[PDB]
Amino acid sequence: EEDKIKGMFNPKIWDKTFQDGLKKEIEDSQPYNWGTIHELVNDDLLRAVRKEIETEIHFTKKETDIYRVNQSGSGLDWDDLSRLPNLFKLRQILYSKQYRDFFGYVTKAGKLSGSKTDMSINTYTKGCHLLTHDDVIGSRRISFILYLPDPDRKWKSHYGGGLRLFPSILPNVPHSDPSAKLVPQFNQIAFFKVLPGFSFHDVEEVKVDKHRLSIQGWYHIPQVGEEGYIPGEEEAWVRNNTSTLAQIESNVLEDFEFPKDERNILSFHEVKHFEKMLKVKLSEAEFTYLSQYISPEHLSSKGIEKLQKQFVENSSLQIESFLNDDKSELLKKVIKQKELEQECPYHSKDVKAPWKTAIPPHKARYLYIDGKEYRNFQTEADILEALNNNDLPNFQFTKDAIKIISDASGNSRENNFDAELALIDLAVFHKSTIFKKYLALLTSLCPVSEQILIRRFRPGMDFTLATKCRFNELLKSNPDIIDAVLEGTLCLTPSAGWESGELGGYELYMMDDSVLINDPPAWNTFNLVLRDESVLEFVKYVSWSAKSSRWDVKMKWDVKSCD
Amino acid sequence: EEDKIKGMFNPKIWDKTFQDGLKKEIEDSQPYNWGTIHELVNDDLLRAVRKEIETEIHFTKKETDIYRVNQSGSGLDWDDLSRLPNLFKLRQILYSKQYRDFFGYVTKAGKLSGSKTDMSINTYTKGCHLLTHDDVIGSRRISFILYLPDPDRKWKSHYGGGLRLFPSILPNVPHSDPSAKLVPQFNQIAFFKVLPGFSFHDVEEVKVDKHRLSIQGWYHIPQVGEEGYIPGEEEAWVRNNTSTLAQIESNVLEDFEFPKDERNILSFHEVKHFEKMLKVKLSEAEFTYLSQYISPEHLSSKGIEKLQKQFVENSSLQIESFLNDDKSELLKKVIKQKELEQECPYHSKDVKAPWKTAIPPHKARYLYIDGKEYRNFQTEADILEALNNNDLPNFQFTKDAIKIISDASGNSRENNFDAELALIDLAVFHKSTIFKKYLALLTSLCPVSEQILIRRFRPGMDFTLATKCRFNELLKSNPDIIDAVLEGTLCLTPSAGWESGELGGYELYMMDDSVLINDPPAWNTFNLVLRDESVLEFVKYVSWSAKSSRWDVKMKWDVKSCD
Ligand SMILES: [Fe+3]
Numbered sequence A, B: 001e002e003d004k005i006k007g008m009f010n011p012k013i014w015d016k017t018f019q020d021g022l023k024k025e026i027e028d029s030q031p032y033n034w035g036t037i038h039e040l041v042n043d044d045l046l047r048a049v050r051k052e053i054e055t056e057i058h059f060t061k062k063e064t065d066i067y068r069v070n071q072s073g074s075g076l077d078w079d080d081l082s083r084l085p086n087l088f089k090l091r092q093i094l095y096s097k098q099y100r101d102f103f104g105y106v107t108k109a110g111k112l113s114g115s116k117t118d119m120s121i122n123t124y125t126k127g128c129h130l131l132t133h134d135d136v137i138g139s140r141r142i143s144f145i146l147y148l149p150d151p152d153r154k155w156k157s158h159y160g161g162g163l164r165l166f167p168s169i170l171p172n173v174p175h176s177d178p179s180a181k182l183v184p185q186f187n188q189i190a191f192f193k194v195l196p197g198f199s200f201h202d203v204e205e206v207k208v209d210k211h212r213l214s215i216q217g218w219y220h221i222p223q224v225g226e227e228g229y230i231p232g233e234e235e236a237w238v239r240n241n242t243s244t245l246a247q248i249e250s251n252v253l254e255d256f257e258f259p260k261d262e263r264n265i266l267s268f269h270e271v272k273h274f275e276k277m278l279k280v281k282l283s284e285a286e287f288t289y290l291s292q293y294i295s296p297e298h299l300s301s302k303g304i305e306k307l308q309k310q311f312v313e314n315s316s317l318q319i320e321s322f323l324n325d326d327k328s329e330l331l332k333k334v335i336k337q338k339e340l341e342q343e344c345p346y347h348s349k350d351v352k353a354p355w356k357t358a359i360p361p362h363k364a365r366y367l368y369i370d371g372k373e374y375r376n377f378q379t380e381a382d383i384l385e386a387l388n389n390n391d392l393p394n395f396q397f398t399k400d401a402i403k404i405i406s407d408a409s410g411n412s413r414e415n416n417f418d419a420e421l422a423l424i425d426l427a428v429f430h431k432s433t434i435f436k437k438y439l440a441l442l443t444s445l446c447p448v449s450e451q452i453l454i455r456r457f458r459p460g461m462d463f464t465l466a467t468k469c470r471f472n473e474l475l476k477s478n479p480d481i482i483d484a485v486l487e488g489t490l491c492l493t494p495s496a497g498w499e500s501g502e503l504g505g506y507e508l509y510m511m512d513d514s515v516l517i518n519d520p521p522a523w524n525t526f527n528l529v530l531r532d533e534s535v536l537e538f539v540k541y542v543s544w545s546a547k548s549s550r551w552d553v554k555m556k557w558d559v560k561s562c563d
């Protein structure tokens, strides 16, 4: 009762002057309303809870596209906490009427469910992380995290594990870079009211070899019977954030994704060449042209049949030493040089031509070169300007634009476009008619469209999430054109240590064990995959631990059978 | 007989030493084998023939896409030449065995038909012309023209009317510029053996106010019964130059046309905007954006309904004062400035970025800006390089490339890109999402693809020939997408005197009287036409007489009904 529960918290939290001060502070916070309280719970109680958890619970590593976490979601039954009396106590006081009134008041959330408790316990160790998300699930009204690292030592900034908040360009379109970061200590709580479209946050990777324990939880909309229940409130809420969010997603939101998952159609000269060949396959002039980039191993009569058969068998190809030695060395030299001697931008504002940042961060983040005009999305107007003035990729005009920049600034070991120029030449090569003629030979498919990107995934920044291919809307009715996207990836990652996947950066292909391909970055490999609409793909978040970025060239084609 | 026929020609032509000398000369001629003979026929006979024709025959003007000629093809019956005994005589000696042996020998043509005579009589007056063609029809083996201008005065070079020969980049792909020109006198014959793919020639416009009379003719493959008849020769020949030329046309030759008649597909952001609107139509922000270029007359509530109704009625729009006053003046100023103070290239080699020359000349010739990388087709390799490395239009990257040229060379009244920059801004505007939203409103059609070109048709050079629209091959199966190309033309011709069509430059739309539209160049007009596959279009050859080039912006879209 009352006094027994209030005694388990810092006495300050029951003080009206403190409460008003805190409500004001949360009201003035940026980038959206959040709060923090130091030394929330009674020290002894919380020390005990930490002891119980270290002693009573096992934590297993779990990796998805969006997180690596040691969870207990093996020891933990929320309906039987008999062996963990201290935790049971914490859960009772955190959901008590006294605390729910306090918490609802300072966050301006209104009333909170007493019965519907929702907690999980996690540890973050080196490499653990949670990417950008907003917490909008079901009936959640407030998010909190209570932190329990070592009570007798300061958790430092460079340890990582910070709670990071994101400012917003529009509703549902957060900025790529965070504008606030909380470095939490023991017995500190962080919390915010859930804001569909705004409450974007993540957990910064833990960077050093330590264990950060925490209790994550949510307060829910009052349920039927409880204080502050309103009939139809929860269902209105859930409806709005689900079926109708999906409705706004297709109608509007996909427009604010960059790069767009769209392909440009090939000319009739190209398509005719492919067709004729499919219904003395390549000329000598053509092998000569191909041999400038491609290893003779894959251009030989037997290399081809081998690849043809693998593709017919698996609907996929994983080639090694794809490029020849002349190109492999040049690319390795210029890429290593850039990695070791030049500064990589670590903020979207610092990214310059020919590079761009993929957005938004709750879908993806990475640097890419698309051959389009320079774009740096810092405001709504920046975005609308692009959507009004869409342009087409021109890799040659990008080499040109590099020279105007290179000649008005000079060149040096610290600032040059050698890597960019080499990679664009690679891109031009893969856009040539003769390359696609070679692709058509390997696969017996006839490409009818293409998109090429050069991508760089920075350590500690960059990642995609699991998604399906996007069918060319306009072509869906053409029965000759296969219900599939052919997808290529040329990995050009020069550094070592990827093999176990612990550093991230792996390309993952899976069924909606369902894993079809799981390739950590390597040097000069080429994956070709013909995806149906059910196949999911992503590149995993690259860890701060990694010695270089993942560099690749990404290619997509719409295809038709010539029978 | 024999001696009576040989006496009607210059006695030199019967001389073996002359004959061998002439055969050698024809053998050494460029750009393909041709010959000429001064004073071929007996002077008196030819003077008489000239008198008969001036006295006995009327000549009527006839204009097509490819020529303006005063013909007799009213006086002239080849089966009854009783009132023209001298001409009958000429025709008998020109087709005589004696002359056919001589002519067949020097041209290395072999035997020639005696019975199958083929002649026509024409005069070229100011403005008369015949564009690039090769003479390959049916059974023709040798072309000749015999010239009968005024016998007692020199026909000068600047009079025009020269016979011009074209060098070849590949078989069937002549160079845009001629490499030989014959200025003919009275009693001179010009002639060549017919060469499928090579014998390209034209008649230079007559530039001054005079009358050039001539007799054009052909010698044919020997017919059944005649000397040198070979069964199946003629039919092999005809077959090869018809059905199988058409086969090579579709398989290969269209690849060497520039610009290509191809459109790039719009993004899903664009298509969705158009659809939503078609199934408080434009926002104020949108009218504001549109009003920067378009005259308020056409943006008003009633201007729109008016245009909507005209389009539903005719499947076409002809708008006047399309652009507003601010843009109309700027464009007129920069275009007039260029016309009056800068030098226009008059040879494909002299054409510089951002401009290109349409090719080949037996299909079209004009200058255009497509937003693609610079291309100057002087060799086979130039062409194959483009086909291997196709690129996509980027009008913004073309403004960029202009600055690298402009800043390494400086600007002046004699050399600047003001006109080009203004026209590209116009092009960017018409490629914007909001413009196409306006286009969709006028027409109730939803654009799904686009091509834009800025074109300049030089006086004395430039023209297109009557052609059909090209359906997007890839889309033909999509039943939502209309079997039509929407086609726009913004004329920006600043000079006067076009009204009667005598200067050329008119846009002609017709049925395969069949004329649907016939618009001489004017200032700031916009034509919109929805072409089915049967509609033919061309811009007429611009005369040397014209005071400026025809300047326009040309736009094409694939479209779908939203019902
Ligand atoms: Fe969260």
Ligand SMILES: [Fe+3]
Pocket (backbone or CB within 6 Å): B133, B134, B135, B143, B201
């Ligand atoms: Fe001719």
